[PDB]
Structure 1
Amino acid sequence: MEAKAVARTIRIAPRKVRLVLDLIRGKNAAEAIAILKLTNKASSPVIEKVLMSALANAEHNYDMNTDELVVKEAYANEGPTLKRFRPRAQGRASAINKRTSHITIVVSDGKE
């Protein structure tokens, strides 16, 4: 009835990935895959990998048909940012956050 897939500590800022993740929430699996393959954002292939992993988990572990499957929920929450610096003028150093994301996709057949 439900299948899960998580990609942890993806080196893309969660604010950037949630833009693409907003497009596939609640959509059909086929439409979600097409959206991901056709939108030109850096986060699309990464989300596509998690989607395909969730679909494979569905098929292989629970034996549900991947034609009646909807993207039950799709979200990204923050991971362990990396702290870097940039040398600015006059000897000062400014912080740079290289943020990471935990991307979760669960697909469902919408039944019980």
Structure 2
Amino acid sequence: MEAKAVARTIRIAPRKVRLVLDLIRGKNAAEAIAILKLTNKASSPVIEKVLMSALANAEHNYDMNTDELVVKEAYANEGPTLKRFRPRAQGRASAINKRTSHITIVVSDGKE
């Protein structure tokens, strides 16, 4: 059985969040918490909050053993962007993309 959580429209950009999200996938659920507490990226308190949420949906909703779970899927999709402008020089604006992310981690124990 699998347990998932998502975080939709997180204001961290998708390229910046997929760095730290590559560090934790495939790894067991206990040590993935320890990686997300020690990397000093901006995304590390956000994926950790989502990994807490999917380990909680495992214990509560599906009654899994949260001690032995492994992070199967850990991906971040693109969300809707906020298109901002920026005045540079000589009356000439340039677009700034405030990108958002849908962060999704799923967790399981590998059994059916």
Seq. identity, %: 100
Quote how far apart the aligned CAs of 1:83 are: 0.2
Quote how far apart the aligned CAs of 1:68 are: 1.1
Alpha-carbon distance between aligned partners in 2 of 1:20 and 1:52, rounded to the nearest angstrom: 16
Quote how far apart the aligned CAs of 1:109 are: 0.5
1:1-112 equivalent positions in 2, closer than 5 A = 1-112=1-112
- Return the TM-score normalized by structure 1: 0.99
Deviations 1:26-72 (A, max 9, x none): 10111100000000000000000000000000000000001110001
SS in 1 for 2:26: coil
**RMSD between superposed Cα atoms in Å:** 0.4
Structure 1: gaps of 5 or more residues: none
SS in 2 for 1:90: coil
Quote how far apart the aligned CAs of 1:24 are: 0.5
SS in 1 for 2:23: coil
Alpha-carbon distance between aligned partners in 1 of 2:68 and 2:89, rounded to the nearest angstrom: 58
Superposition misfits of 4+ residues, deviation over 4 angstroms: none
Structure 2: gaps of 5 or more residues: none
Count of aligned positions: 112
Deviations 1:60-87 (A, max 9, x none): 0000001110001100000000000110
Alpha-carbon distance between aligned partners in 2 of 1:85 and 1:6, rounded to the nearest angstrom: 30
